Symmetry: C3
Subunit: 114 residues, 3 copies
């Protein structure tokens, strides 16, 4: 009874990153298009604790997705703190508000008509 515009998933990729200390993250990058809008979502998960910023090489494809954000960085909520994800010259950085004894999972999206 309420109508919808057409929609599709135009990107859905995942990648595992690991830093020099053996901490590992999985990231998923998703793009949905719906009508005039595009939504890009970053999902992040680690089983590990994190005692400082997480830095690791990212693929060209993930790097492209991450750099597209209108602010060049992704504010992300995890259960025990906040992070910021950004990429520079193919290196992902996740900066954190506080040490995280468990990172858990979170997501960050932007949704635009541009």
């Amino acid at each position: 009874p309420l109508p919808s515009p057409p929609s599709k998933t135009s990107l859905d990729i995942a990648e595992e990153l690991q830093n020099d200390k053996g901490v590992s993250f999985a990231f998923q990058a998703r793009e949905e298009e719906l009508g005039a809008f595009t939504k890009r979502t970053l999902f992040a998960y680690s089983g590990d604790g994190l005692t400082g910023p997480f830095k690791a090489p990212a693929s060209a494809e993930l790097s492209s997705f991450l750099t597209a954000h209108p602010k060049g960085r992704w504010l992300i909520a995890f259960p025990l703190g906040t992070g910021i994800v950004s990429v520079d010259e193919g290196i992902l950085t996740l900066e954190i508000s506080r040490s995280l004894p468990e990172v858990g999972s979170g997501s960050s999206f932007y949704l635009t008509e541009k």
Copy 2:
């Protein structure tokens, strides 16, 4: 090996709202049906900071979706604070727990067998 009931997406719409001060939000309203259940999710994003409640006219369709919530309001977590979204006579209000230097993104859902 674990079975699922049938499911579908019965609604997926998005809309851009802007207040008198030039702050802009994108909202997405999604309905999933799975077996006996219906899940309605509100996604919200702004690149802007928010220095007080956000108020703006919403479409009839978005207003209908928002008013359906069993509490008549949507509790929503953003990375830096909490909000409540409600609608009255076609005007959306997002009230916030604290000033937000960046709103970022968040979602709020309800899931029911009714």
Copy 3:
């Protein structure tokens, strides 16, 4: 222009749980497969407040999904506090960081290449 591996939703189920005091939760369990990766997401919603841990019998299927987590428990963010979901002998427990006047909604996922 950016390629994706194949993906599908391999599980999507929902269930309503109720404790001895009449508090009720809806849980949704979803599995996505994308390329090498599997993502398992638990969605949780209650309209009720919660004044202590929520305990209730869960189906064998939900119990199976919950026990699969690499930590045997799911750290979950709600708007007003944090929880941990686990299952033992078919009884779900949601432990909470603080009393919640409204639980609202939240989700917890893990994403792995195993």
